Amino acid sequence: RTSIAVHALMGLPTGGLPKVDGMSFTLYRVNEIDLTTQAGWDAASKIKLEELYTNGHPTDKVTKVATKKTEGGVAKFDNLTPALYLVVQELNGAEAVVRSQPFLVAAPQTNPTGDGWLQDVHVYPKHQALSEPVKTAVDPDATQPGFSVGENVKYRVATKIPEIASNTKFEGFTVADKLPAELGKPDTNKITVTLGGKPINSTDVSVQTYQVGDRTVLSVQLAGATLQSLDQHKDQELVVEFEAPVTKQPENGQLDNQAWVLPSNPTAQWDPEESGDAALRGMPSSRVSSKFGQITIEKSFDGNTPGADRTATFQLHRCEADGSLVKSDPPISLDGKQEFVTGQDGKAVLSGIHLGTLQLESNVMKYTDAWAGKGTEFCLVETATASGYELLPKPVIVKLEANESTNVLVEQKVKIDNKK
Numbered sequence: 001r002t003s004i005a006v007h008a009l010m011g012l013p014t015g016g017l018p019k020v021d022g023m024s025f026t027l028y029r030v031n032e033i034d035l036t037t038q039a040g041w042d043a044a045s046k047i048k049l050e051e052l053y054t055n056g057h058p059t060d061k062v063t064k065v066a067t068k069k070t071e072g073g074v075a076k077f078d079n080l081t082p083a084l085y086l087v088v089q090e091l092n093g094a095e096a097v098v099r100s101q102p103f104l105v106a107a108p109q110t111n112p113t114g115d116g117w118l119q120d121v122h123v124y125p126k127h128q129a130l131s132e133p134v135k136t137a138v139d140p141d142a143t144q145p146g147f148s149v150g151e152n153v154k155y156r157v158a159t160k161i162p163e164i165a166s167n168t169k170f171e172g173f174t175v176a177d178k179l180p181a182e183l184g185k186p187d188t189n190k191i192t193v194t195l196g197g198k199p200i201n202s203t204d205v206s207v208q209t210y211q212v213g214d215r216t217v218l219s220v221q222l223a224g225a226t227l228q229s230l231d232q233h234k235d236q237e238l239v240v241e242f243e244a245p246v247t248k249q250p251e252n253g254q255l256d257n258q259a260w261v262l263p264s265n266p267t268a269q270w271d272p273e274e275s276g277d278a279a280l281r282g283m284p285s286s287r288v289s290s291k292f293g294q295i296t297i298e299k300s301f302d303g304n305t306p307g308a309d310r311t312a313t314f315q316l317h318r319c320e321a322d323g324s325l326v327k328s329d330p331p332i333s334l335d336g337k338q339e340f341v342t343g344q345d346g347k348a349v350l351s352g353i354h355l356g357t358l359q360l361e362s363n364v365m366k367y368t369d370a371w372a373g374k375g376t377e378f379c380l381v382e383t384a385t386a387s388g389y390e391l392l393p394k395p396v397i398v399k400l401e402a403n404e405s406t407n408v409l410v411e412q413k414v415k416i417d418n419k420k
């Protein structure tokens with residue numbers, strides 16, 4: 001009884017590399033090869049790997065034995081019958097990599113010293129790592145700072161093309177992004193794809209969206225000439241950019257996005273944030289988290305609930321440190337509204353204010369305030385009030401801000417009592 005110990009090495013073959021855990025391998029037995037005979041030994045020497053395995057799947061010429069992941073640098077398939085085996089690295093490892101090709105392993109083998117049989121065989125397939133893509137958010141329109149509800153966000157996903165084993169090809173190359181639920185569908189005229197800062201043969205690039213529950217997945221897949229020559233673009237970036245509408249305030253204030261890179265072109269619509277053991281494992285991007293806030297106005301009229309015949313109107317603005325309006329400061333628009341009227345209960349809710357974004361910059365997570373450089377705070381200006389009441393003469397400062405630690409909705413309640 002024999003064993004095959006698979007050690008998954010990260011690095012480039014030549015023609016002591018680090019062993020990697022969580023690399024997934026399936027062991028198959030090669031049918032009808034008896035290496036103790038000349039019939040079988042010579043059949044083994046004629047074998048074309050494409051006969052045993054082709055198009056990402058085994059043929060009927062092999063029988064599956066088991067599948068497992070490396071741990072402590074090894075996936076050991078123990079208690080094996082003497083046979084010719086085929087070791088297949090799979091796409092469902094703990095981390096996404098450019099996987100090893102299928103390869104044959106006889107068990108037992110002769111000890112390299114010649115001194116007897118080697119029952120416990122070791123093999124050392126090489127794979128190449130995928131770098132974590134860098135996802136950022138950009139405000140695509142500067143008319144209003146940020147991307148509060150009612151405006152569009154833009155995302156940029158930069159993926160490095162790894163150097164792969166000489167004379168091998170990428171199996172495929174997919175970048176997928178399951179947009180957060182608060183976003184609408186991406187504008188198809190604003191999805192762009194560049195490789196090495198160059199546009200790609202659009203015939204080779206398949207841009208698709210599909211719904212998975214209440215979220216849109218955007219998928220960019222390289223195929224054809226472009227995929228075939230992608231091994232010549234080592235260390236270049238594939239950059240996907242897109243815009244989408246911010247349609248609602250995240251309930252927890254967090255508008256969070258990640259993308260994923262998969263070195264494969266799945267035939268089924270792939271959800272990169274799918275779960276189980278068989279799931280094709282993508283390499284996740286850096287996270288982007290945009291922070292939102294909400295202002296609630298609680299209006300009273302000489303201490304009373306306003307009721308049916310009293311209402312006030314406010315606009316949201318930015319103010320300088322002295323409480324004065326920023327020069328030429330426009331009213332802030334939220335979900336297409338630019339003023340806010342108090343209800344009979346005195347409430348007015350200003351929701352979906354995008355405050356800023358936490359994203360990777362030079363490999364460090366950094367928060368940027370979307371309103372940086374437009375004053376120092378938000379403020380409310382009362383533009384109308386009830387019959388016989390006096391308007392508030394100055395903006396009402398409202399402290400509403402986020403930072404790198406923000407992980408719930410930022411709120412401020414503003415109690416305002418109107419006076420005769």
Ligand SMILES: [Ca+2]
Pocket residue numbers: 139140141142143144145146147151
């Ligand atoms: Ca904007």
